[PDB]
Design an enzyme around this catalytic site. Structure first.
Site, PDB file in Angstrom:
ATOM      1  N   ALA A  62     -50.225  17.379  -1.981  1.00 43.88           N
ATOM      2  CA  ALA A  62     -50.607  18.808  -2.008  1.00 43.88           C
ATOM      3  C   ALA A  62     -49.868  19.582  -0.926  1.00 43.88           C
ATOM      4  O   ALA A  62     -49.765  20.822  -1.029  1.00 43.88           O
ATOM      5  CB  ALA A  62     -52.106  18.919  -1.865  1.00 43.88           C
ATOM      6  N   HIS A 121     -52.424  12.056 -11.310  1.00 44.95           N
ATOM      7  CA  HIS A 121     -53.795  12.619 -11.315  1.00 44.95           C
ATOM      8  C   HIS A 121     -53.957  13.667 -12.412  1.00 44.95           C
ATOM      9  O   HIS A 121     -55.072  14.210 -12.524  1.00 44.95           O
ATOM     10  CB  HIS A 121     -54.189  13.127  -9.921  1.00 44.95           C
ATOM     11  N   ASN A 154     -44.737  14.598   6.901  1.00 40.78           N
ATOM     12  CA  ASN A 154     -46.148  15.051   6.865  1.00 40.78           C
ATOM     13  C   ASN A 154     -46.510  15.664   8.213  1.00 40.78           C
ATOM     14  O   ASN A 154     -46.050  15.111   9.241  1.00 40.78           O
ATOM     15  CB  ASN A 154     -47.094  13.912   6.497  1.00 40.78           C
TER      16      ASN A 154
END
Ligand SMILES: Nc1ncnc2c1ncn2[C@@H]1O[C@H](COP(=O)(O)OP(=O)(O)OC[C@H]2O[C@H](O)[C@H](O)[C@@H]2O)[C@@H](O)[C@H]1O
Ligand SMILES: NC(=O)c1cccnc1
Ligand SMILES: [Zn+2]
EC number: 2.3.1.-
Length: 288
Positions: free
Chosen positions: A50, A130, A230
């Site tokens: 995300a 997903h 990240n």
């Protein structure tokens, strides 16, 4: 919608860990090292979560203002866009170009936001582990429909529309709820691509959700290299050959500059079923 569906009984993991920023000189060194790994690797697999859509106005799950982090405070997540009005980020369009020039072999995403597909990224090199908010599937013939608007259901329920193939099968959403097993075809392809890669690069995922978050380790188990990009720590930080703490758009724009590649224009939502023949790319530097 998605948040409301998974909120009860699902394990939300570690929310709101602090962000880390590599200082500028260290960031520049690490992105040069990422370019070296891309130049030297035969089979590169990207893993997205995300964090690659936060710069288009879509909140993540576990960041400082993530869905779960905010839920803990009794606050709703904040969208700066609808799913329909969202544009692909610089990172989304960089991944399109890396596939077009043959420097990306496969892309595994946990994102349901539909932006990889809408960016024009070829579906035959994408695993959407997903689901995709815009995709419904016929329960009878398995034909998928990529819609211009979000399919209004989650948890693999009937949408109310019927299959139109020369069928009338019940169309269902492709959004997994917590207790749903991953789509078998996408997971098998993602597992094969991850095992076959000599380089796995994770972008904007905390890698907390199984089995999606463990696929990059398949690359390491077979002697391949692992890069994690990240802002927060991730579950698998100990396994990374290279850890980059910065905004993924800053990392990917600097990477594309090192590779001599332009980030292509987005011509608005477009669906590409099959990868087109690979484009030319710059010749490679002499490293050492
Ligand atoms: N611009 C940015 N640049 C770099 N890192 C960023 C950025 N924005 C956010 N991050 C980082 O991006 C990370 C995003 O981690 P998480 O929020 O767990 O999202 P997931 O995709 O891994 O969630 C997996 C599944 O969990 C759900 O149940 C759904 O099913 C999801 O598919 C954070 O650590 C941020 O620090
Ligand atoms: N990027 C995403 O797919 C997403 C979906 C729902 C909530 N937050 C993020
Ligand atoms: Zn059908």
């Amino acid at each position: 919608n998605y948040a409301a569906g998974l909120s009860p009984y699902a394990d939300k993991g570690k929310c709101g860990l602090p962000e880390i920023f590599d200082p500028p000189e260290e960031l520049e060194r690490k992105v040069w090292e990422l370019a070296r790994l891309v130049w030297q690797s035969s089979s590169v697999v990207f893993h997205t979560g995300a964090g690659i859509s936060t710069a288009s106005g879509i909140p993540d799950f576990r960041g400082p203002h993530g869905v779960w982090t905010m839920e803990e405070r009794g606050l709703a997540p904040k969208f700066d866009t609808t799913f329909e009005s969202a544009r692909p980020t610089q990172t989304h369009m960089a991944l399109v170009q890396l596939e077009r020039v043959g420097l990306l072999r496969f892309l595994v995403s946990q994102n349901v936001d539909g932006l990889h597909v809408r960016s024009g990224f070829p579906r035959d090199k994408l695993a959407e582990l997903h689901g995709n908010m815009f995709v419904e599937e016929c329960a009878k013939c398995k034909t998928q429909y990529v819609r211009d608007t979000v399919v209004g259901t989650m948890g693999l329920k009937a949408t109310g529309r019927l299959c139109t193939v020369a069928c009338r099968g019940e169309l269902r959403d492709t959004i997994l709820d917590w207790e749903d097993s991953l789509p078998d075809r996408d997971l098998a392809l993602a597992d094969e691509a991850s095992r076959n890669a000599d380089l796995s690069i994770t972008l904007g995922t905390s890698l907390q959700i199984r089995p999606s978050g463990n696929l990059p380790l398949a690359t390491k188990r077979r002697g391949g290299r692992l890069v994690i990009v990240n802002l927060q720590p991730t579950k698998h930080d100990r396994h990374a050959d290279l850890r980059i703490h910065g905004y993924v758009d800053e990392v990917m724009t600097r990477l594309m500059k090192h590779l001599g590649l332009e980030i292509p224009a987005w011509d608005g939502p477009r669906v590409l079923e099959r990868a087109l023949p690979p484009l030319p790319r710059p010749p490679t530097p002499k490293l050492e």
